[PDB]
Amino acid sequence: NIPITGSMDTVYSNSTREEVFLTSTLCLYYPTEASTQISDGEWKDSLSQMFLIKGWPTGSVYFKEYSNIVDFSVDPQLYCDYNLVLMKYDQSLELDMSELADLILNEWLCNPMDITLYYYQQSGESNKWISMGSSCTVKVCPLNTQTLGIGCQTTNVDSFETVAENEKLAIVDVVDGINHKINLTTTTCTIRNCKKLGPRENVAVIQVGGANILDITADPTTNPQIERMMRVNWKRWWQVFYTIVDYINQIVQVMSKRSRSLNSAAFYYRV
Amino acid sequence: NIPITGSMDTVYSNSTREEVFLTSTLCLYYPTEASTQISDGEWKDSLSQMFLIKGWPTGSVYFKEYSNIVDFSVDPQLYCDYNLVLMKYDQSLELDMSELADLILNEWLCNPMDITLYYYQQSGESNKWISMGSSCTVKVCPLNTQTLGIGCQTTNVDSFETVAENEKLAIVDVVDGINHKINLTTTTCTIRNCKKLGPRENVAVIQVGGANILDITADPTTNPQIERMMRVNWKRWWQVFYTIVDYINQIVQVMSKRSRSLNSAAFYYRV
Amino acid sequence: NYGLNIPITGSMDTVYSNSTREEVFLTSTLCLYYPTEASTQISDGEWKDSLSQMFLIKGWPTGSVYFKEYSNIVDFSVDPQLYCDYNLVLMKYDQSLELDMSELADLILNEWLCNPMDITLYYYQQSGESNKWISMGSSCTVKVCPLNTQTLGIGCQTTNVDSFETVAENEKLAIVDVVDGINHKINLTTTTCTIRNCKKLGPRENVAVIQVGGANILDITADPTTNPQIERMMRVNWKRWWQVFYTIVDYINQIVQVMSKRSRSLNSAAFYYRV
Amino acid sequence: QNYGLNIPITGSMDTVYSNSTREEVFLTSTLCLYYPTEASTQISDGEWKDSLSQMFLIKGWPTGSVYFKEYSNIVDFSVDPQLYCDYNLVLMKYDQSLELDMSELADLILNEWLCNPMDITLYYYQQSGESNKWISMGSSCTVKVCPLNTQTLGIGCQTTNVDSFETVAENEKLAIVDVVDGINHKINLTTTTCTIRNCKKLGPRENVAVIQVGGANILDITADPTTNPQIERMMRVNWKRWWQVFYTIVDYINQIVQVMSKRSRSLNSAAFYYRV
């Protein structure tokens, strides 16, 4: 990063809202029960026409339905330029909802893990292991300096310490600085060693249900309410979508253009 | 575009080949008979590795099969950042190959036509009508200033002068200045009035078979040869792919990044 | 040691003059290479004598003109020996021979330096864009298997030749290119077909390839981007071999004016075998 | 690099060249031994190539830097002898009555010949001068020459009666035939099995050294009768055992290579004259 000098007297520039609405795309990820309750199917076209009033051209809005939160957690591709994630809260899904929110909101640099050969440590605070799949049950057996289990026997998977069971997505943090042996169902689930970089400006999460419960920061001490974790009450999905459409300017104002020299190619819905 | 002054003694910048290969995607479009002759199926991954040797990241190369030339001709969507189009020449497909090459190689600004109602002229030299679908059969009837057909009755479609039949794609040019009544088979084909902007520098077409026959310029007088219309003799598709991979530096150098502000969203494959 | 390091200073105003002499042969020699189709259609056998008699009036003394007769393009591609000084090669175009004609043209029109390749023992690479592998013989089936850095075949198992990848099958001549900098394990029928690691020096200009038939299809440069039109890549249009030979004889002064007797080699081979 | 031009080279005479030191040619070049098959038969072995390569390594030549190209016998090797190699040694075993065949083979592989083709059934030929010969190579060459006077009428021979021709060689796999320089000749030889080429002699070939293993000095390579030079590359050694001969060659290989030199035509310096 080179320095960029700037005066403190230059006049504020005009509003760039129209430029960004003409140049960018918005995409909404909502659960299937939304469409089920709406009981329609001209509704995507109607909402596109409705967005056109707020100033998003006809092709700018992309509605990507997903089955439900736990099933969408498994490797979410956010094919867009401004991402909204409607997220219906149900009791006992708190941790999984938080996991998904952390995953998409935060920028991660992930490396493959070969569970069958190497025992993996965690470098520090920012490192986690993310396991995604149809059913991930990661079991961890910590190891000594001589590679012998403590609280576990390295060859008896039954004595291992389970930290996730049958979960589509698990973000495990273990004690940093200790080698571990992992048992995860290699045919089903894929585990990656990831480091949390800064935040992802592209995505916003609209919790639809209950109290302020999302905790992106795995640290117990800090529980910061980030601006992109919006929340709203609901009884009717039509009311939720009308709320979003009416207040779309505020939402995209909260979000901001993504900035990262990525290396993994993937499909994007850009103009 | 505002003026851009420049000095004639600026030192040449360092090469950007590494940067562009690190921040772009190469985008191969090959016929299905290619893979059938290959008789393999790790070959996509193997070619990705052989591209990684040349410099591209592991996922930056995207392979897209297509059925055959006309079936690709209908709706060419180039879902990626540097497009190479392998194109096997066989006899009697000269004009459809040329039509496809022209359509992908030039930028078109274009909009629909409601054939059943209006009469349509053509603005000038750079204004064609592009018909795409399962089976296009344009049948045109020129009119007079009095709105009576010449060589054709305005009502009797049987007297209309057909200018293409049963083609998946047709880039039809008619006399520029005469109101034409069109019949086209609305079910299995759609016709859109299109105007030709500057070149689409993002694509490059590699004719695999025999001699130079592509004539993208519909004008008889001019038959220019463009750097992006490559031609390579062949007997084995493995040899074709190996030549392309080895000389990819030359190909991407010949090709340039796109420059056109689109008003439409689409699925690109970027990094 | 021809002192090929010091510059030669010319002058830009003096003069247009004559070339003195050179005493290694009484005069240059012209040298046709035609297919047997020509003889069969001509249906003669004093015709070489007649063609020599007609070159004599063009100004070529008797012993200077020689004729060579190859079976066809593929059978000439194997070890094309140019035993001679001004070589013309009449290549009758036929459909599906486009790549083979291009192979032969790229072979003879350019000056190759070839090393041996012991396929059974070692893997091989390609140093740069100018380095090809040239395989010749009665029948070549070059199956390659590229290996990663760890000497593990990618897309192929080095122990199973069936998984190897056939870049060219059953060819009399194959100028095969593979991705540069990657080791390859090669497999070809060593009894019948041999292979060589050949780098491309500059162009050879004894040879004029006269495509007798169709359109401009010769692509000597393996680069897909470039497709140059060399002056020696001639293309004439034909109905009858008498007309073809008569055109060559009539215009032979231009044919040799566009060539150079200098770039000639001791041995008649199409490459310099450097062991 | 200014190829294809004769441009003079000026050079100081009193230059120290204290940097100049011995060049280790063997670290890069490739030695290349040709021996008769009876050598192998007497040796009665089959890792002797390996043993000699190991001994060459101990002299200094890398493992892959020595080739052993067997040849059946002198006559069968004489036909189209192609020495595509970087330092050729040829162990010619001498037998009585093979004097001229050894001499002509040695001439062929010691002198660089520039060869034009010939069409015997179409043209008459005359040798330009001292440096020109006709090289006839094949399974069995039988050259019959009919000299022709100015009126194209044969002398000592009828132009049509091949039988009256004057045989200059018969049943020879190699024949460097020299005739009167300045006389047109009509040639006759068995075109299917033997080829003949009009060959000028350029300078010497320095890539090749010929160890005569047997008798006295008989190699008169110069077709002139007056001059009988002894080129240093025409080496000679007595013998009673092929193992002894091979050990001698391996022991003294450095001196042999000093006698030899890099092929002049092979270098880039000869790029546009007659490069090979």
Ligand SMILES: *[C@@H]1O[C@H](CO)[C@@H](O[C@@H]2O[C@H](CO)[C@@H](O[C@@H]3O[C@H](CO)[C@@H](O)[C@H](O)[C@@H]3O)[C@H](O)[C@H]2NC(C)=O)[C@H](O)[C@H]1NC(C)=O
């Ligand atoms: C982490 O722990 C699980 C729990 O055991 C491991 O599952 C085990 O996987 C192996 C290989 O897939 C199974 O081996 C099987 O053995 C039977 C006979 O014992 C044989 O018929 C099969 O062909 C196969 O070899 C093993 O049964 C299976 N264990 C259980 C309880 O089903 C898992 O492999 C561990 N993770 C890693 C990375 O090894």
Ligand SMILES: *[C@@H]1O[C@H](CO)[C@@H](O)[C@H](O)[C@H]1NC(C)=O
């Ligand atoms: C910015 O806003 C002011 C006030 O509305 C307007 O006068 C000006 O033209 C705007 N800037 C541009 C570039 O249009």
Ligand SMILES: *[C@@H]1O[C@H](CO)[C@@H](O)[C@H](O)[C@H]1NC(C)=O
């Ligand atoms: C500058 O160019 C040189 C080429 O010699 C290259 O090695 C170097 O990496 C380049 N530096 C940058 C920053 O691109």
Ligand SMILES: *[C@@H]1O[C@H](CO)[C@@H](O)[C@H](O)[C@H]1NC(C)=O
């Ligand atoms: C074209 O003509 C056919 C036959 O008269 C008719 O069925 C079809 O509807 C016509 N299409 C249009 C667009 O007029």
Ligand SMILES: *[C@@H]1O[C@H](CO)[C@@H](O)[C@H](O)[C@H]1NC(C)=O
């Ligand atoms: C050079 O060649 C031409 C060819 O016609 C000849 O007329 C001329 O006399 C020659 N030069 C000299 C100095 O004779």
Ligand SMILES: *[C@@H]1O[C@H](CO)[C@@H](O)[C@H](O)[C@H]1NC(C)=O
């Ligand atoms: C080529 O492959 C065949 C099997 O198809 C094998 O028998 C042969 O030895 C291989 N050639 C070489 C030189 O290894």
Ligand SMILES: *[C@@H]1O[C@H](CO)[C@@H](O)[C@H](O)[C@H]1NC(C)=O
């Ligand atoms: C050796 O030294 C001389 C002068 O001392 C110099 O001209 C020459 O270039 C040097 N050559 C080498 C190979 O060092």
Ligand SMILES: *[C@@H]1O[C@H](CO)[C@@H](O)[C@H](O)[C@H]1NC(C)=O
């Ligand atoms: C050599 O002589 C024989 C004997 O008559 C003859 O048949 C043959 O044609 C002669 N060779 C040539 C090249 O004419």
Ligand SMILES: [Ca+2]
């Ligand atoms: Ca335990």
Ligand SMILES: [Ca+2]
């Ligand atoms: Ca979870």
Ligand SMILES: [Ca+2]
């Ligand atoms: Ca941790």
Ligand SMILES: [Ca+2]
């Ligand atoms: Ca927390």
Ligand SMILES: [Ca+2]
């Ligand atoms: Ca078409």
Ligand SMILES: [Ca+2]
């Ligand atoms: Ca009509």
Ligand SMILES: [Ca+2]
């Ligand atoms: Ca027009």
Ligand SMILES: [Ca+2]
């Ligand atoms: Ca044209």
